Design goal:
This is part of a larger assembly, with chains A (56 residues), B (120 residues) and C (122 residues). With 56 residues, chain A is mostly loops. Chain A has one domain. Helices cover 14% and strands 7% of the residues of chain A. The relative contact order of chain A is 0.14. Chain B has four helices and three strands. Helices cover 51% and strands 17% of the residues of chain B. By secondary structure, chain B is α+β, with helices and mostly antiparallel strands. The chains are: A little secondary structure (56), B alpha+beta (120), C mainly beta (122). The structure holds five RNA strands. Chain C: GO terms for molecular function: large ribosomal subunit rRNA binding; structural constituent of ribosome. Chain C: It comes from Escherichia coli.
Chain lengths: 56, 120, 122
RNA sequence: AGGACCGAACCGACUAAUGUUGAAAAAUUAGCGGAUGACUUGUGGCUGGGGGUGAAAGGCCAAUCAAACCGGGAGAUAGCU
RNA sequence: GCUCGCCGGAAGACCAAGGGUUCCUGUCCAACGUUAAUCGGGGCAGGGUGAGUCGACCCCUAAGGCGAGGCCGAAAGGCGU
RNA sequence: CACAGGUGGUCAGGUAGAGAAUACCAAGGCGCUUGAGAGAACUCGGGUGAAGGAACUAGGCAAAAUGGUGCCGUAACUUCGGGAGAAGGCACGCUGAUAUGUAGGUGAGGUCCCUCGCGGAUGGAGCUGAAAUCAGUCGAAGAUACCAGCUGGCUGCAACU
RNA sequence: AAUUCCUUGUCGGGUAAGUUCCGACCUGCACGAAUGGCGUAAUGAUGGCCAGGCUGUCUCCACCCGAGACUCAGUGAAAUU
RNA sequence: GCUCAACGGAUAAAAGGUACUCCGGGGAUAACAGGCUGAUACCGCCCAAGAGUUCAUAUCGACGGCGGUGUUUGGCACCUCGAUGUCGGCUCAUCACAUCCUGGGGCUGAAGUAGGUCCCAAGGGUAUGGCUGUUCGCCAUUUAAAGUGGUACGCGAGCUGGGUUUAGAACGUCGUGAGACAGUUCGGUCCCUAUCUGCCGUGGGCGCUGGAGAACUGAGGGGGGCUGCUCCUAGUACGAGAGGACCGGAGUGGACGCAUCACUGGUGUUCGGGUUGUCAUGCCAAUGGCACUGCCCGGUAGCUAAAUGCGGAAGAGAUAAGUGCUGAAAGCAUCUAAGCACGAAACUUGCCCCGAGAUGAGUUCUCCCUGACCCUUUAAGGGUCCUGAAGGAACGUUGAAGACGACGACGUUGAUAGGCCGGGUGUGUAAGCGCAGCGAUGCGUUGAGCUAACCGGUACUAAUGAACCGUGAGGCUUAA
């Protein structure tokens, strides 16, 4: 249920070795607007694959 | 065990699921563009596209089926008067899902669902 | 599909009306007696002044089941009740003379020929 | 008529599951007993610790009871750890 | 704002008790809110509670309390007209 | 503690219902201050289940089951009250006729009388309204949902509440 | 026997099989007459036994619906050492 | 002047209960389990009076003797009292062999069937119920068999809580009583979110010496190994009969295991229908919400057992007890000393699965990269520019794959998912309308309407031009 011995800094770090975050590999550039966006996601201005399909 | 099954539970019982998709289909037919979660849009496809397909042949029986599945006479009227004639030459694919980032409150993936020719 | 503790009707004129299976004969840990399988039974109801009497312990053969038999083409014959035919312990011949209700060809073995001969159907 | 019967409110607490660093220092759900009476309940009052009260279980007397709590004798005493 | 769902002898309305500004408006989001918060019973500021008839006070008394003289008791004090 | 608990009194709509039960609703008020996915083991709360039917287990624990109204029928024993809703059996929706709403309740006009009106017999309009027989009829099922006794036998103890 | 050690006493009933139960017996270790004896209809969230019905209790588990478990974002304990 | 006698004499003067209990201690000291021992227990052997129809040793074996185990009852007080939860049951097991069944064999008071006893053998298998808290035991009915023991009398941070071992109460008995009883009776709270070891699964990293994609060898590891009945040989051998085989062959079962969904079914709150009450969509008609999916009736795909396929082997090698052949020591005799031949479910293989982190990191096939300059502690060195291949990864649509990783399919050179069309399956004749009937309702249009996961098709929607990681011929020595 509970420890008998305090685990160490070392074992803490080894357990945390798989906690690293994977940064975004590469952002896609819009062909019309040239904005950077996540692939298959629309741009902040509302573009996607060169077309402005967003009301705003 | 989920082998060859269809439909997402979406962490709801079946009654809440039916009511939610009824409301959401009404909203999509009304506005022609709605922001929702990605899996919800994936299921709204299956809810809304059969309804528009039903709205092709204009008959009293189809009107009553649509009203049974929608419970909104304005939505039924818009379907049979506008979206039937609009999509009458299209074999399915009346809708379009565009992924649009994540929700601030809970990091849920977000998608716009649109009717393929809304012109707004 | 007959287990221990299950009640069976009697399809013969030996006297017993209802009997209870108390051991499924065959091998060890054997679970079920189907049609054509020998069971050990105790008589729970019997007509007065019959060949057998209440409380007797003897052998029987299952001749009808609700679970039914499967035929080689894949058909199933089910019955509305489970019935058996009483037998002597040490000779395995039927106690009674008449057989009531239909039977199946699963009893087409050299030992149950006397049941098949006097059965009204099949 | 009834310390009568079935049964809500209300008063209780027989069984089971849950929960047991609980939602809760005693509860929840499903069932369960009484339910015009020796009933239940509000407001105020009285009984005080070798005392009270007790259809009596050593029960209850502010989550404390084979002798409450607070302060004192008091740094009791401890051939023991 | 529109749909959807729940309570409806209550999860609705109003009192007593208890609380004390939580009430309404403007503003702010450090901390508090088991998350975010533009919101809040949170911080800051200002406002809001109008009685011959409602309640209290008041006049009357119940259980009980206190109790001039009094009886009683080492003192304290107990009982009582 | 912004805590599944406790906290006296008043108000008491509609439909069905004996009902303040229960179901769905009105007025009114809320979705309970983390969410989004996924749809493993296992745990918790439920649904269904072939054949068998207590073989489980310390034990039918827990579950399943019964469950309503009317009529009929109702044992041992008994303190003559009971036991008793003993056990057990039958019927049950909807439509029409009897009878454009029957039996019954209320009762306008109008007649009449009057120690006199807020008046007593007549009258029956309107409104409300069981229950039953017959005939038909739909369903697998008519107490259809919620709600709603399991029954019997032998025995110890304690009269009983 | 809520009382009996030997004891699962003996015989019978009920079960295929009954240390339990029911009835009879009497060698009552160690009943007994208001610390009452023996019966007793009715009552019981009372102990024991048997039967009809019912069933996932079980043979022997299968499938399904929800809440967790698992992953993602936010906040963020504990015993122990 | 002391039975101050507990005799170095507490006081002149003193008994009990606590299960209502308390506090300081002690593993200095009992109960559990462990430890030492092994009287006792169990097993084994030595002698042979005797039993066994004659006959000590087929089978037993008195009087006495010697060991083994650690296994019963005990002995000791070594660990634990600043806590090592007790009996039985359930779930899950694991070893031993002193073998219960199945295999091999010697003897037999072995004619045959059936047995007894001893030796070898631990691969697999190895009851269900009534009674009782039971372990045992008795009984019923089975089976090839229902083995004996160890594992904290295995197994409560896995379940239970019937029994023992609290607090309530009662009977018998004892006691003046409080109470008590290795008597009986009814009732009576079982916490823990797993850090480490272990174990079952599944990933990330690096390594394997230039990188990458596949396909393997197989060192090593795991799984599996049970058996009944019937018929033929054969009513033969044997036997006075009664009975009745060895060896060999065939079929058909029980339990267990793997796979699967064609069948029979279960489930199927995502499909269709019936129906109760109520609210609603202005109303009729029709639908929807809610009441456990309201309650029910069926039922697709998937999952699934009760359903249906398959399996345990044969064979080989080396052997156990055992049987021998030849054969001396020891002219004979002798299975043994040399040499040779058989011999079991046990061992190694053969059967299935994992398997190169097998750091001893293996093998095979294919693919890819073939540019210039500077620098200095000259080396398997550092740096700038060009180049960025094979491939991978990431992202997306996703799966009969999956907790998450992972694994498989697909991304416009496209059937990967949704939709759509056609079919199929399921439910069972929609709505609207017409006709008949007073009406409920019935008939026709109509096997209609609707239909999830299925089958065959179809780019309608969504799977993006890109970017990202991965380099630029790959060390030394010797030898051919």
């Amino acid at each position: 249920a509970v420890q008998q011995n305090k685990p160490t800094r070392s074992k803490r770090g080894m357990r945390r070795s798989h906690d690293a975050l994977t940064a975004v590999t590469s952002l896609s550039v819009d062909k019309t607007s040239g904005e950077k966006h996540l692939r298959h996601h629309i741009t902040a201005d509302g573009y996607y694959r060169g077309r402005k399909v967003i009301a705003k | 065990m989920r082998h060859r099954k269809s439909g997402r539970q979406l962490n709801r019982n079946s009654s809440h699921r039916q009511a939610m998709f009824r409301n959401m289909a009404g909203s999509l037919v009304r506005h022609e563009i709605i922001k929702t979660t990605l899996p919800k849009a994936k299921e709204l496809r299956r809810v809304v596209e059969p309804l528009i397909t039903l709205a092709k042949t204009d008959s009293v029986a189809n009107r009553r089926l649509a009203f049974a599945r929608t419970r909104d006479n304005e939505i039924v009227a818009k379907l049979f008067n506008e979206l039937g004639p609009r999509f009458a030459s299209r074999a399915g694919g009346y809708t379009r899902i565009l992924k649009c980032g994540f929700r601030a409150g809970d990091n849920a993936p977000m998608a716009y669902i649109e009717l393929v020719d809304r012109s707004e | 599909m007959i287990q221990e503790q299950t009640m069976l009707n009697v399809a013969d004129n030996s006297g017993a009306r209802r009997v209870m299976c108390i051991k499924v004969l065959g091998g060890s840990h054997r679970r079920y007696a189907g049609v054509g399988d020998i069971i050990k039974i105790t008589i729970k109801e019997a007509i007065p002044r019959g060949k057998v009497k209440k409380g007797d312990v003897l052998k029987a053969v299952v001749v009808r089941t609700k679970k039914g038999v499967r035929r080689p083409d894949g058909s199933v014959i089910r019955f509305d009740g489970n019935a058996c035919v009483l037998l002597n312990n040490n000779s395995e011949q039927p106690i009674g003379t008449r057989i009531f209700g239909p039977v199946t060809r699963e009893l087409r073995s050299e030992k149950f020929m006397k049941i098949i001969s006097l059965a009204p159907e099949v």
